[PDB]
């Protein structure tokens, strides 16, 4: 865990945010609010347990507790909800903006120091462990608070103060026809870990394209599967963390709730004497398995100890070259092992030495693995995956041992096999050409389950109670027309090459 | 789908592939960069000697192959026994 995330959005309640160079372009307030909607939807599906708030500045009215003028808070730091989405969308649009300007003011003098006070106080309100005091704001101009030198000085003083307090903030470039005026008033006063300010950005060219994009995932935090241990012989033991860099996600379980109250009704379940109508007890339980006629009775710890073979841990078997593993031999999704000094101190040194040595030897680690108590231990192989970096020196692959599992004899399922049949080499060349026609470079993040996407689409659609639900796009459908036009007549050429001209492959 | 060729037959193998959701990325510091945990050379040599003692394959003479000293893929699951 080690902290949580929270963002607060700041919108200039002025008239510059309520115009457009051309009607094809929305107002700054318009694309800001729609990007806010997209961000909130993403947070709900991704990390709904975070904190989000909305505050406005420059408006005529105000709502902050300290009651600084022009400082109207809209929403406080809370887990996002569809109600907030509705509150935002009631003013999102070419007329909802007018509704907002009617029921709410816009355009007045203020001090950025005041909004910084308000946001700092809002930070003070939250109490859970917190890690990312990210602040987001939206405008296309900087100099209005540089107009008053005293206002500029106090604003930059408070900005330095909040930077000292660990607060991090980010601004979106908005389309100002005369240029946002980078480097004039903000990047010297705002918090940046890097400098790319080169163009005063007459347009809104910054990272809205990423933010408006909707993501659909869960992004489970880095949680150690176990600090399980490797028993070398009987006493040489090291502490290593267990991880799964891939973990099959699935649709969240439903919650059974009422009809007219919609309340999730608790469901107590028990067992009673059917022959009597009385009541039975968990102690009054006996499991049976009848093979033919004889009935055999087993109990709780009776069924437990049959699963008992050894203590949960890793028991080294030996070493074998990596090549001696058949690729088609697969059991289930692989695991990953990372060292740790939390329990066994110096175990990281041993892990590094083993990784380097076995990488030199090109050998695999054979070991007996017991996940937890009362489980049959299974043999596994630890292939050393070296940490690989990129042009950005980011870990495209972390260091450690990828944990692949070794199937047993029962796993092997033989099938009715046939003889070996060969093919003419010219047909093989035709296949090579046809493959080259439709070849491409695979990338892992280029594909996704459309079924869960459609599930989400429906979920937020009924949440947003529109006329129609959003339609997900299947990225797993082949481009049949594109592939066919890309191949040409080679398809039918090989069809007559191999398949009989009179007999189609269809029966 | 990838091929699998035997002496008597050849066939393709299907392995289900994950989507973007199934994947997850976490930070993992390299130990070699952490010089506080750099093994000594003598320790490395002892490790290599143990590795040689842990070689569960034998380089066969008169036919250069690595025979398996412990084939587990042809071993049943003792839980049922």
């Amino acid at each position: 865990y080690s902290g949580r995330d929270s963002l607060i959005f700041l919108v200039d309640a002025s008239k510059a945010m309520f115009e457009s160079q051309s009607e094809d372009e929305l107002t700054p307030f318009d694309m800001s609010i729609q990007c806010i909607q997209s961000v909130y939807i993403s947070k709900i599906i991704s990390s709904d347990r975070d904190l989000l708030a909305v505050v406005f500045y420059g408006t005529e009215k105000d709502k902050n507790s300290v009651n600084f003028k022009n400082i109207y808070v809209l929403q406080e730091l809370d887990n996002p909800g569809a109600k907030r989405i509705l509150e935002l969308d009631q003013f999102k649009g070419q007329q909802g903006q007018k509704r907002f300007q009617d029921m709410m003011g816009h355009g007045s003098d203020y001090s950025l120091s005041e909004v910084l006070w308000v946001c700092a106080n809002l930070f003070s309100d939250v109490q859970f462990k917190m890690s990312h005091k990210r602040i987001m704001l939206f405008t296309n101009e900087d100099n209005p608070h540089g107009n008053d030198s005293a206002k500029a000085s106090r604003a930059r003083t408070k900005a330095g103060d909040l930077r000292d307090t660990g607060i991090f903030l980010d601004l979106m470039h908005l389309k100002k026809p005369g240029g946002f005026d980078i480097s004039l008033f903000y990047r010297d006063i705002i918090s940046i870990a890097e400098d790319e300010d080169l163009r005063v950005h007459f347009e809104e060219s910054s990272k809205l394209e990423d933010l408006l994009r909707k993501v659909r995932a869960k992004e489970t935090r880095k949680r150690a599967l176990s600090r399980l241990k490797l028993k070398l012989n009987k006493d040489i033991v090291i502490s290593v963390g267990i991880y799964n860099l891939v973990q099959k996600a699935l649709k969240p379980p439903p919650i059974k709730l009422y009809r007219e109250t919609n309340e999730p009704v608790k469901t107590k379940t028990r067992t009673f004497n059917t022959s009597t109508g009385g009541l039975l007890l968990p102690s009054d339980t006996k499991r049976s398995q009848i093979y033919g006629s004889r009935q055999i009775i087993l109990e709780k710890e009776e069924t437990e100890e049959l699963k008992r073979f050894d203590d949960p841990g890793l028991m080294l078997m030996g070493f074998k070259p990596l090549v001696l593993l058949k690729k088609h031999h697969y059991l289930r999704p692989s695991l990953f092992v990372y060292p740790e000094e939390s329990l066994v101190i110096g175990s990281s040194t041993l892990f590094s030495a083993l990784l380097i040595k076995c990488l030199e030897k090109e050998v695999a680690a054979l070991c007996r693995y017991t996940p937890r108590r009362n489980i049959p231990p299974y043999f596994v192989a630890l292939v050393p995956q070296e940490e690989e970096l990129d042009d950005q020196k980011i870990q495209v692959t972390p260091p450690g041992f990828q944990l692949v599992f070794l199937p047993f004899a029962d796993d092997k399922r033989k099938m009715p096999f046939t003889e070996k049949i060969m093919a003419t080499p010219e047909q093989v060349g035709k296949m090579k050409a046809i493959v080259e026609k439709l070849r491409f470079t695979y990338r892992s993040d280029s594909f996704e389950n459309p079924v869960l996407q459609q599930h989400f689409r429906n979920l937020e659609a009924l949440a947003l109670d529109l006329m129609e639900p959003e339609q997900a796009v299947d990225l797993t459908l082949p481009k049949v027309e594109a592939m066919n036009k890309r191949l040409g007549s080679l398809v039918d050429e090989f069809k007559e090459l191999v398949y009989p001209p009179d007999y189609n492959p269809e029966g | 789908a990838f091929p699998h060729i035997k002496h008597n037959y050849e066939c393709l193998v299907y392995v289900q592939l994950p989507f973007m959701e199934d994947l997850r990325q976490y930070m993992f510091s390299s130990l070699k960069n952490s010089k506080k945990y750099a093994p000594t050379e003598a320790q490395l040599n002892a490790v290599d000697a143990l590795i040689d003692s842990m070689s569960l394959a034998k380089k066969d003479e008169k036919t250069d192959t690595l025979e398996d000293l412990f084939p587990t893929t042809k071993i049943p699951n003792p839980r049922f026994q």
Binding site: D5, S46, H132, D210, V215, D390, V473 | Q25
Partner: peptide
């Protein structure tokens, strides 16, 4: 941090859908 999803801290910024090109 470069190569990081701003919307989702501490995580890779996914590349959008690309499909396949013809060369």
């Amino acid at each position: 941090c470069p190569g990081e999803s701003l919307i989702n801290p501490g995580f890779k910024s996914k590349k959008p859908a690309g499909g396949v090109d013809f060369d």
